[PDB]
Each structure stands twice: as structure tokens, then as C-alpha cells.
């Protein structure tokens, strides 16, 4: 069941004594006219605070259970009134599922209303008053016990009548102390417009007039991002699907620059025999981008494919192609037996078998000098102890899987202190208009309401500005259409009211608003809500603007007429 907590749940936030003062404080209070969950056993959360109340007759209700896990293996606060006193414990007790160990703190101390407030260290406020279904009226809860137990609490339960629970919320209240220091009344600063007016005036009565209380702001709904359409993509079909590949010693190198570096082709293509990345993720390549992309394409045998990697040694890793110890790129190699192997053995691809010194990374040596393996200089004779380093490859279709040719392409990224123009695609959502959006076009970020504009930009212009150097219009990069930008409506809130000595019925005016962003009268001052519009004209009672004056008259309600000049 649910019940309406009229005015209860108000406590003293401090010790200090204030006499005849309307103090305004922000703390966790029970919101006025809230919904108290009526029970009559179950456990409950302890998010930020509780207004546990009760309506006992002969001490039917006994105590409270607190903690996180509500059982052993975790500390749990414990308060029960066993007809003698309240025993407070913080030991990891073994509570049953329905009652009625490493201790760190211990303490042994329907016409009733035992109102209690609990919040965390742990503080308890209590006030017992006779009553006659929460009663209407006001009573403050003086603090009764404070306990320095410091237990993390999230749930609570009850022992054992009327058994209500309220929840505390961080709301600002205006507390009416009396001459003796007793809080005799309070105002919730967010219950309704009249309560806001009382809070902003720091008074429990308000005289006739129009008072500005708060600022109304339209918040954006969705973010929009638009970037120019996909331009010319980087060349990846003339490299990965080229007709003829180069020999490994004379590996074909191509520098990719000034284009969009889409990698999607290397992702959907499932025919790659190897896609391995070093230093960077195989998928996070599009995010970070550099000046140039280098494609090194050549053909080797399957037995030496594993040698295309940093820290590799072999007939290929040091005589035909070497990778640095640290590498910024990825290697891709796929079987090309049907493209590089012919009948009778394909011997059109070569490699280097003899070399004086290991090749420096990213160095190509096409020299075909005669190697001197012994001590007799050759002088280009190709005889005993003199060899031709350019060994051919035995590529035939009848080779095994490992002896078939493999087309290898290596991608290297180099970044220096220079403009970088080679990256992936950017975001580009659908265009929405007539709504306060958080736009971000090709470079500029702002909040506004885009509308189909009327200005005629120049061919090369992408921006719009006013005299105050404020962004006004934008040309959409995808569809070359100019858009007007108007900030989404803002302004102030004013509460038009006759005196509380007369009534508590107020009318709210939103300044400079078209009534579509908040019985509803639209004026030049703004959207007037809660005031009738009369076709008569009387003397001005409460000014509004542009000749509109609202007044409280005949039952009786608040009207909004156009004032008469005598």
C-alpha cells in the first residue's frame, strides 16, 4: 500500500539555536507530499536515508536491522528494544529470515507515532507524539542518538500495526524557527511555484506581485555529427589484387598518401593466409593516422613467411628483407600458387642467398655482384668459390602447401612533424532539424536548432557569423545546403501571484518562449501558464509586459487582460 506523507519528516540538521529566523538549508529531507510505502516483515534498501515511522499501541514494534548483507560474513548494525533497553551492536550476527562475532562497537542503554530518521556516520532522530493514515500537521524530530560505528549500510529490515517507510532526498528546505528555537514550520523549495517563491523571498508570506524565481533552460536531446562524404579511397585493389608481383630481393614499394585509409577491404577479405600486427591493434588502425602509408609487396615461399617479422633470422630475414626490432605496421601474406606458378616450374622470381652483412631494416639490395666465399677475389668470373647470389625459386603447381609461393604485402606507418592526411572514414549521422541538438559539423561544435536557411553562401564558404562574431549559419558538408542556427530557448521563470493573504493560486510566466518548450496564454513577454485571458480591460494590478497585466478577480481565479489607460 501507499500513503501521502503530508508534512512529516523534518529534523534538526544541526545543534545550533536560532530564534525567530527563517533559515534555508540544503540537506537530505523527506520531500513534501511524497509517497510513503505502507507495509505491515520485508527487507528494504538504504540508498541515502529512511523516515521509518510506526503506529504502535502497546510497544508491538520492537527494533531495527541494518547492514549490507544482513547476515554473517559482513558487519550489521542491530537495535532492539527487548522491554529493557536498546542494545546496539555492529557484530556480524546470524539474523534469521524473520527474527523478533568480531564486534567493534557495543552499547546497552493506535495513538502513537514513533517517527525515526536514519542516515549515515550513523545518526538517529526521533520524536514520539500521540495521534488519532499518517496525520496531517507539523512536528520536528530532535536528534536522539548518534553512533560512531561507521558501517557501510545499503539494506535494512524490521522486527515486531501501521509500518511506514519514507526515503530521504537531497532537497532544500526553508526552516521556520521560533523564539524558543523549535522548528514550527518549513517550506519545500521545489514542491510547487508558490513554494519556490516563498523560498527565494526567504518568507512564509508573499505579497501581491510577479517574482522571478528560477531560470528555464531547454536541454539538447541528441548529438549530431556530419562530415564530408567518402572521398577518393587509398589504393588497396591495385596492390592486393595487382596482376604481377615483384621478386623478394627487389621488393615492390609504394607510398600511399593523400587519401582515406579504409581498412575494411582487409577485414572482409577472408582469403588472407596471415594478418599479423605489431605494436598496434589489428582493429584500432583507423583511429590513429600518420603522414604516409608504405606498401612493400613481394613473393616468397611458405617456409620463410614466418621470417617476415621483427627479430627473425634466415635466408630471407637478413639477405632480402629485414624488419626493425621495433615495428609500426602489420604483415599480410596469402597463397598465390595459381598466380605465380606455371607448368614446368616458374623461375621468374629470384632471391638473394649470399651477402657479406645482414641487411639493415627497410633496405633493398638489387646488386648482382659475384660473391667471394673464400679468399680468392672473383672479379666477376662465377667459378670455383664464386657464386651468383640471385637464386631462383622452384615454383610448380605440384609443390606441397608449404612450398607454394606466397604473395606478401607489408604495411608500414611513418609519422613525422608534418601534416597527416591519410586516415579512415569519419562519423556522419542523419540530419535532424527543428530540435535543440548538440551539433558537430566538419570542425565546429555547438548547440542550437538547425533550420532550413535562406542565406546564399559563396562557393568556398562553410561558416556563418554575426556582428558579435557568433556562429550563425553552417553549410552542410554532405549536402551543400545552408542551415540557420538559433540557440534553443532559455530565459527566466516568474511566478505571478496575489498575496497569500488572499489565495495560494499562482500563475507562471516563461519569458521569451513559444509555449511549445515547457489555460496557456501566449503574450509578447512569454508563455503565461495558469491564468485566464479576458477580453475586458481593467487597471493594471500585476504588470507583465507589452501592456498585459494579470489580476486576481472573480469562483475567483487569475486573469490576464490588456491594461486600460484610464
Amino acid at each position: 500500500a501507499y500513503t501521502n506523507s503530508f508534512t512529516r519528516g523534518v529534523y534538526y540538521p544541526d545543534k545550533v539555536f536560532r530564534s525567530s529566523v527563517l533559515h534555508s538549508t540544503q540537506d537530505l529531507f523527506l520531500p513534501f507530499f511524497s509517497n510513503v510505502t505502507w507495509f505491515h516483515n520485508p527487507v528494504l534498501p538504504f540508498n541515502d536515508g529512511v523516515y521509518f515511522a510506526s503506529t504502535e499501541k502497546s510497544n508491538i514494534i520492537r527494533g531495527w536491522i541494518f547492514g549490507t548483507t544482513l547476515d554473517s560474513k559482513t558487519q550489521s548494525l542491530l537495535i532492539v528494544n527487548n522491554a529493557t533497553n536498546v542494545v546496539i551492536k555492529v557484530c556480524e550476527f546470524q539474523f534469521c529470515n524473520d527474527p523478533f562475532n568480531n564486534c567493534t562497537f557495543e552499547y546497552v542503554s493506535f495513538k502513537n507515532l514513533r517517527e525515526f530518521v536514519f542516515k549515515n556516520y550513523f545518526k538517529i532522530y526521533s520524536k514520539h507524539t500521540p495521534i488519532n493514515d499518517l496525520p496531517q500537521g507539523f512536528s520536528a524530530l530532535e536528534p536522539l542518538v548518534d553512533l560512531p560505528i561507521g558501517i557501510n549500510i545499503t539494506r535494512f529490515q524490521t522486527l515486531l500495526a501501521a509500518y511506514y517507510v519514507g526515503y530521504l532526498q537531497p532537497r532544500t528546505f526553508l526552516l521556520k524557527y521560533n523564539e524558543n528555537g523549535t522548528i514550527t514550520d518549513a517550506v519545500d523549495c521545489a514542491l510547487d511555484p508558490l513554494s519556490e517563491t516563498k523560498c527565494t523571498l526567504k518568507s512564509f508570506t508573499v505579497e501581491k506581485g510577479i517574482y522571478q524565481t528560477s531560470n528555464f533552460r531547454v536541454q539538447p536531446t541528441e548529438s549530431i555529427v556530419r562530415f564530408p562524404n567518402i572521398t577518393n579511397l587509398c589504393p588497396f585493389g591495385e596492390v592486393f589484387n595487382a596482376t604481377r608481383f615483384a621478386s623478394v630481393y627487389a621488393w615492390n614499394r609504394k607510398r600511399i598518401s593523400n587519401c582515406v585509409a579504409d581498412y575494411s577491404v582487409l577485414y572482409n577479405s577472408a582469403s588472407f593466409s596471415t594478418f599479423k600486427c605489431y605494436g598496434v591493434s589489428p582493429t584500432k588502425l583507423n583511429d590513429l593516422c600518420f603522414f604516409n602509408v608504405y606498401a612493400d609487396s613481394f613473393v616468397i615461399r611458405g617456409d620463410e613467411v614466418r621470417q617476415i617479422a621483427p627479430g627473425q633470422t634466415g635466408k630471407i630475414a637478413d639477405y632480402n628483407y629485414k624488419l626493425p626490432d621495433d615495428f609500426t605496421g602489420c604483415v599480410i601474406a596469402w597463397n598465390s600458387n595459381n598466380l605465380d606458378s606455371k607448368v614446368g616450374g616458374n623461375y621468374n622470381y629470384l632471391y638473394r642467398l649470399f651477402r657479406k652483412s645482414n641487411l639493415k631494416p627497410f633496405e633493398r639490395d638489387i646488386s648482382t655482384e659475384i660473391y667471394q666465399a673464400g679468399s680468392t677475389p672473383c672479379n666477376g668470373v662465377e667459378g670455383f668459390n664464386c657464386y651468383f647470389p640471385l637464386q631462383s625459386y622452384g615454383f610448380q603447381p605440384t609443390n606441397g602447401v608449404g612450398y607454394q609461393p606466397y604473395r606478401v604485402v607489408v604495411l608500414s606507418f611513418e609519422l613525422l612533424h608534418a601534416p597527416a592526411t591519410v586516415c579512415g572514414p569519419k562519423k556522419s549521422t542523419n540530419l535532424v532539424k527543428n530540435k535543440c541538438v548538440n551539433f558537430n559539423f566538419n570542425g565546429l561544435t555547438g548547440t542550437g536548432v538547425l533550420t532550413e536557411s535562406n542565406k546564399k553562401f559563396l562557393p568556398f564558404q562553410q561558416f556563418g557569423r554575426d556582428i558579435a562574431d557568433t556562429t550563425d549559419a553552417v553549410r552542410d558538408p554532405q549536402t551543400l545546403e545552408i542551415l540557420d542556427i538559433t540557440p534553443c530557448s532559455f530565459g527566466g521563470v516568474s511566478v505571478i501571484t496575489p498575496g497569500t493573504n488572499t489565495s495560494n493560486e499562482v500563475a507562471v510566466l516563461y519569458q521569451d518562449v513559444n509555449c511549445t518548450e515547457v489555460n496557456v496564454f501566449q503574450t509578447r513577454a512569454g508563455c503565461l501558464i495558469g491564468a485566464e485571458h479576458v477580453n475586458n480591460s481593467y487597471e493594471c494590478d500585476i504588470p507583465i509586459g507589452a501592456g498585459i497585466c494579470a489580476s486576481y478577480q472573480t469562483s475567483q481565479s487569475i486573469i490576464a487582460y490588456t491594461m486600460s489607460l484610464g
Partner: nanobody, 119 residues
Framework: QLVESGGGLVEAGGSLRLSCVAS????????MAWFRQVPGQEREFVSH????????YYADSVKGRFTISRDNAKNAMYLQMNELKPDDTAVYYC??????????????????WGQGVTV
């Protein structure tokens, strides 16, 4: 090369912790994985961890259950289980490689392989 620890009979619902220690690798510029062996059937992939542990993936039949981690201070990484279904009882193999691959599910893309955990 890759010495691994952990494994044993479980209570069919508890938790277990597996480790794989590299004894001859720098472990700071290498990427590992976890693969599963079942008799009478092919080799299965389960888990994978990148450099440091900021980019990790998991199998579709194991996602959300097991957690992977690595730490360079001891040249080893930790795999912790949380469900241990009576269907995942199999042979555990620790792999490693210099880099990370797009075809990270393929067994051929892990040159280094460790010993086996108890079935």
C-alpha cells in the same frame, strides 16, 4: 618454453585459476592466447589477451564467464574461471606470439605453444 600451472578437479560450479609462465621470452612485446583440446575432435579457441590487457576478446560460447589478465613483473599471465561447466572439462594449451592477428581465432596464428593442463 612456455611453462604453465593450475588445473585440477573442480566442484562443478566453483572457481579455478590458471597461469602460463614464459621462461625465454621478454613477455613485454608478445601476445598470448588460450586454446582448448578435446579428444576425438579438433582444437578449440577460448580466450585471448593483447599487450598489457587493454584489448581482450573471448569466445562466443565462453563470453561473460572467464576473465583474463597479464602482468609483466613475473613474465606470466593469469586466467581465472568463474563457472566451470561440466561441459568445459578439457585439455588446456597456452599459446603466444610476437604480435596480435586479425585471424586471432586461427590456431595457425600462434607459433609458440605451451605444455598441457590436467584434463
Amino acid at each position: 618454453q612456455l611453462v604453465e600451472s593450475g588445473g585440477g578437479l573442480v566442484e562443478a560450479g566453483g572457481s579455478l585459476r590458471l597461469s602460463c609462465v614464459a621462461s625465454g621470452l621478454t613477455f613485454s612485446d608478445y601476445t598470448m592466447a588460450w586454446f582448448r583440446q578435446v579428444p576425438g575432435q579438433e582444437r578449440e579457441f577460448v580466450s585471448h589477451i593483447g599487450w598489457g590487457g587493454s584489448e581482450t576478446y573471448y569466445a562466443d560460447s565462453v563470453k561473460g564467464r572467464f576473465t583474463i589478465s597479464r602482468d609483466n613483473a613475473k613474465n606470466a599471465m593469469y586466467l581465472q574461471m568463474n563457472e566451470l561447466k561440466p561441459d568445459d572439462t578439457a585439455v588446456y594449451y597456452c599459446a603466444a606470439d610476437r604480435g596480435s592477428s586479425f585471424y586471432y581465432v586461427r590456431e595457425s596464428e600462434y607459433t609458440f605453444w605451451g605444455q598441457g593442463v590436467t584434463v
